[PDB]
Design a protein around this nucleic acid. Structure first.
Ligand SMILES: Nc1ccn([C@H]2C[C@H](O[P@](O)(=S)OC[C@H]3O[C@@H](n4cnc5c(N)ncnc54)C[C@@H]3O)[C@@H](CO[P@@](O)(=S)O[C@H]3C[C@H](n4ccc(N)nc4=O)O[C@@H]3CO[P@@](O)(=S)O[C@H]3C[C@H](n4cnc5c(N)ncnc54)O[C@@H]3CO[P@@](O)(=S)O[C@H]3C[C@H](n4ccc(N)nc4=O)O[C@@H]3CO[P@@](O)(=S)O[C@H]3C[C@H](n4cnc5c(=O)[nH]c(N)nc54)O[C@@H]3COP(=O)(O)S)O2)c(=O)n1
Ligand SMILES: [Mg+2]
Ligand SMILES: [Mg+2]
Ligand SMILES: [Mg+2]
Ligand SMILES: [Mg+2]
Ligand SMILES: [Mg+2]
Ligand SMILES: [Mg+2]
Ligand SMILES: [Mg+2]
Ligand SMILES: [Mg+2]
Length: 738
RNA sequence: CUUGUUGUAUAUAUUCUUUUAUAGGUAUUAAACAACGGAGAUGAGGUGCGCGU
DNA sequence: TGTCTATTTAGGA
DNA sequence: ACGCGCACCTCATCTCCTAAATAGACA
């Protein structure tokens, strides 16, 4: 098992940004040639050239000339079948003997073995291996009719296999049976999928073969692996260099060969690598060959690698607890009732309801909901609705937000005074995160506004469309990303996001240490894999209100409605400029609806910026060294299942059978579930059941392996709403909703 | 070399910043508590803006 | 010439 | 809604982190 330590170089090093730009340009040229000749040259055609020009009897020329690899194209060098070193040597010596990457040496005259062969070429090769060893095809979706040609139905069956992972016979039984029991089902699409199931059960192997062949065919238009302009780093592999402790110091000295002689590079010390620590022995004894020089914030850092052991424990299943991630009332809700049993735990919802100034502003419903929440072990009182009052000055929650903030900051002051440091850090990070997200939202909105201003100012004119050959030249030559205005906004956004990430890590560390210290052996979590939810909140933009909805040519007095759009028309959302002959010329966003668009952007961005799916990763990282292991469970029907029956709710539609009811019929409001409990305290007990129950543990979660770094003790087996719905019915965990 | 990175002060000034305003930048003041496998690339998504329908 | 650094090679049949 | 082009960000996934022998260069 490997690891990294990053060091800060102390004095001056000859490795500047030119030494790295040269490395990047060489990478780009080599990868350019590799992609341009991915299919045009066969392996034997290169091995023969090496044999004739050099006359060497070696395995890397004696493998490309064998009949197994003789006529296959270049890209088979990166496939997992070909020997790694033989392919590296064959490709490198063909490239070298032909001088195809335009190499003229490096400025520091580092040994070509370390700068070129085991340097940027060894990275080009690995980047083309990851591209090729996992190769896919891009298929555009297309609406079909009943009388559709077999090829289009054949192609759209390929499209569906990619997007829904339907490769067995049963994976089409489940997906059909999951979108068909929907109450008032959509007949437009179910027929399409029933038709596409016919092709799969008729032309299965043909489908797979055509998938693979199309994936190879599209590779001709592949642009190649490109090293980004913002990378500012360089990797060298050197077999013989030494790292020694700087005498009478906590730092280190790096001796590497430059220009056929040793150059001393002095490094600072790391508290990870301290004199009396086994970590220093492990680093010094067994440091690896790869050396990374990376420039970050105008500071040179050198990364090494070494071998260290892992002692991650194994799951015990004696004391478990679930955890759900929300955004409206609390960031993390656990499956534990707050009974003053967690040492070092501070309940902020108990605290906030002890103040009469806070409960006064709450309605009789809100009071009851907050008191419901306060009886549960909870964390990080994120308030999505209250927080947006900071940006929206004319909001209905502005006064409640101020009271909340004042009480939280006062608790912060008190905890600081009383020397309860962990709770103080937790409270301060909650407070900082709440404002940092608002800062991020303001900065990103400014980015959007500035980009619109710049794009409108430049005034692009296109001769035609559908191809970059027709689009205006200045779009690629002068992007907004290169403007000085954009760069500072992006840097401020980076700073804000860095603060956000640190605060989230502090909160998660607090939670993990609380549960570890109180005897909990496992923490269960949803296997969250995506946080880029579609922005379902729609307020049609100005252009879409004149070029798509055709509201431009309508009469001002008598407007042709389009379903819900008339509701927007009635409300003061758009200040439609009228025309002389009772028509509409131009549309303007009224401020009342502009605030609604802002709220849509705010909530949409909160999902991503707070790393909704990455909470499990932080818990896993803390579990690498801790005493509590993290179990990942399926993230379907945990906020829809009863937590005492342990059953999903199925109703009957018309003269139908048991069908899955709508999610809004089990969660009447976001804070409650039909069985009474909180909609999150309900989910947290669903998450706990999958790992608490021995029988359910095997069905939904992978078997316990040997411990591994950054890998949960348990992980999910099957993925997708349809897959979970079937396994629920086999143990008959289903109840009839009235 | 009481040594790297990140987070944590509603601390002191500020004719600084609504392009971080319960926060930052600009200089000062203090204490620790934590976490720390890095780099590159590929792919899938979402979202912003422009141009056409 | 001796020591030090840089370059070549690594297989399965 | 769609297409198209320019960018930003979040997630999953993969590669890779060796070692010996010999050739060349300089003192
Ligand atoms: N719904 C709704 C609600 C609400 N809303 C609204 C409200 C408000 O309003 P305003 O704007 S302010 O006002 C104005 C106007 O409007 C109107 N209205 C009202 N209301 C309404 C409605 N409802 N509708 C319409 N309209 C309306 C009137 C007036 O005048 C807004 C907002 O605001 P605020 O601030 S308050 O906010 C809030 C709300 C929100 N939400 C909610 C929900 C939803 N859905 N959505 C939304 O938005 O939020 C907030 C709060 O927070 P929270 O805590 S609740 O959070 C949560 C949720 C979220 N989400 C989800 N989803 C989504 C989307 N789509 N988008 C976005 N977001 C979201 O997130 C979080 C999480 O939690 P949970 O626990 S639930 O978890 C979950 C998640 C996950 N998933 C999902 C999905 C997907 N795709 N993915 C994923 O991952 O999972 C988990 C679990 O679940 P469950 O258990 S239920 O299960 C289920 C699901 C699954 N699936 C599916 N698919 C899939 C995939 O692919 N994958 C996976 N893995 N999975 C999955 O499965 C199962 C089944 O399914 P089905 O059934 O088939 S679908 O607005 C609205 O609008 N809406
Ligand atoms: Mg959840
Ligand atoms: Mg910061
Ligand atoms: Mg995962
Ligand atoms: Mg919940
Ligand atoms: Mg630092
Ligand atoms: Mg520091
Ligand atoms: Mg101040
Ligand atoms: Mg502001």
């Amino acid at each position: 098992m490997k690891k990294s330590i990053k060091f800060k170089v102390k004095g001056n090093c000859p490795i500047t940004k030119d030494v790295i730009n040269e490395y990047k340009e060489y990478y780009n040229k080599c990868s350019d040639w590799i992609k341009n000749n991915l299919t045009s040259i066969t392996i034997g055609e290169m091995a023969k050239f090496l044999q004739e020009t050099l006359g060497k009897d070696v395995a890397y020329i004696s493998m490309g000339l064998s009949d197994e690899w003789k006529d296959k194209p270049l890209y088979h060098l990166f496939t997992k079948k070909y020997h790694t070193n033989n392919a590296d040597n064959l490709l490198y010596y063909y490239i070298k003997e032909k001088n195809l990457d335009g190499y003229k040496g490096n400025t520091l005259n580092i040994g070509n073995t370390f700068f070129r062969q085991f340097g940027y070429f060894k990275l080009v090769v690995s980047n083309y291996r990851t591209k090729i060893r996992t190769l896919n095809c891009e298929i555009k979706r297309k609406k079909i009719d009943a009388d559709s040609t077999s090829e289009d139905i054949e192609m759209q069956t390929m499209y569906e296999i990619i997007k829904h992972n339907l490769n067995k016979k049963t994976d089409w039984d489940e997906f059909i049976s999951y979108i068909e029991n929907v109450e008032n089902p959509n007949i437009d699409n179910i027929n399409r999928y029933k038709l596409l199931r016919k092709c799969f059960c008729e032309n299965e192997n043909m489908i797979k073969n055509k998938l693979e062949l199309l994936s190879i065919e599209q590779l001709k238009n592949f642009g190649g692996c490109i090293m980004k302009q913002h990378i500012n780093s360089m990797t060298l592999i050197i077999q013989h260099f030494k790292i020694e402790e700087k005498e009478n110091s906590l730092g280190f000295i790096l001796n590497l060969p430059l220009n056929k002689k040793q150059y001393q590079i002095e490094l600072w010390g790391n508290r990870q690598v301290n004199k009396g620590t086994k970590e220093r022995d492990a680093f010094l004894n067994t440091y690896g060959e790869n050396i990374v020089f990376i420039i970050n914030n105008d500071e040179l850092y050198v990364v090494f690698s070494y071998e260290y052991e892992l002692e991650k424990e194994e799951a015990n299943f004696v004391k478990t607890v679930g955890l759900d991630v929300n955004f409206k009332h609390a960031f993390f809700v656990t499956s534990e009732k707050d009974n003053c049993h967690l040492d070092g735990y501070i309940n902020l919802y108990k605290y906030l309801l002890e103040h009469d100034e806070f409960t006064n502003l709450l309605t009789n419903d809100e009071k009851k909901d907050y008191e419901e929440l306060s009886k549960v072990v909870t964390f990080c009182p994120f308030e999505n609705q209250l927080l947006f009052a900071r940006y929206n000055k004319m909001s209905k929650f502005c006064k409640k937000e101020q009271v909340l903030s004042k009480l939280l900051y006062a608790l912060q002051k008190q905890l600081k005074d009383e020397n309860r440091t962990k709770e103080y850090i937790y409270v301060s990070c909650v407070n900082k995160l709440r404002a940092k997200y608002v800062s991020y939202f303001i900065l990103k909105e400014k980015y959007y506004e500035k980009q619109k201003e710049y794009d409108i100012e430049m005034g692009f004119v296109d001769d035609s469309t559908e191809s970059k050959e027709s689009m205006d030249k200045r779009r690629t030559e002068f992007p907004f990303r290169n403007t000085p205005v954009a760069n500072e906004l992006l840097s401020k956004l980076n700073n804000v996001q860095q603060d956000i990430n640190g605060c989230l890590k502090n909160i998660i560390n607090y939670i993990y240490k609380i549960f570890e210290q109180n005897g909990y052996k496992i923490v269960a979590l949803e296997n969250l894999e995506n946080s880029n939810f579609e922005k379902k909140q729609v307020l049609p933009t100005i252009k879409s209100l004149l070029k798509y909805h055709k509201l431009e040519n309508q009469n001002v007095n008598d407007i042709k409605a389009s379903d819900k759009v008339k509701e927007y028309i009635e409300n003061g959302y758009y200040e439609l400029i009228t025309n002389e002959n009772n028509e509409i010329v131009d549309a303007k966003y009224t401020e009342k609806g502009a605030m609604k668009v802002k709220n849509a952007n705010f909530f949409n961005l909160m999902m991503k910026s707070l790393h909704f799916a990455s909470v499990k990763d932080e818990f896993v990282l803390l579990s690498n060294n801790g005493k509590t292991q993290i179990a990942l469970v399926p993230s379907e029907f945990t906020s829809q299942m009863d937590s005492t029956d342990h059953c999903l709710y199925m109703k009957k539609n018309d003269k139908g059978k048991l069908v899955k009811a709508d999610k809004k019929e089990v969660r009447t409001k976001q804070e409650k579930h039909i069985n009474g409990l909180n909609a999150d305290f309900n989910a947290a007990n669903n998450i706990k059941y999958i790992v608490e129950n021995e029988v359910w543990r095997e069905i939904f979660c992978t078997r316990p392996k040997k411990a591994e770094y950054n890998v949960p003790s348990l992980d999910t087996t099957k993925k997708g709403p349809s897959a979970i719905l079937h396994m629920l019915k086999k143990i008959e965990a289903i109840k009839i909703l009235e």
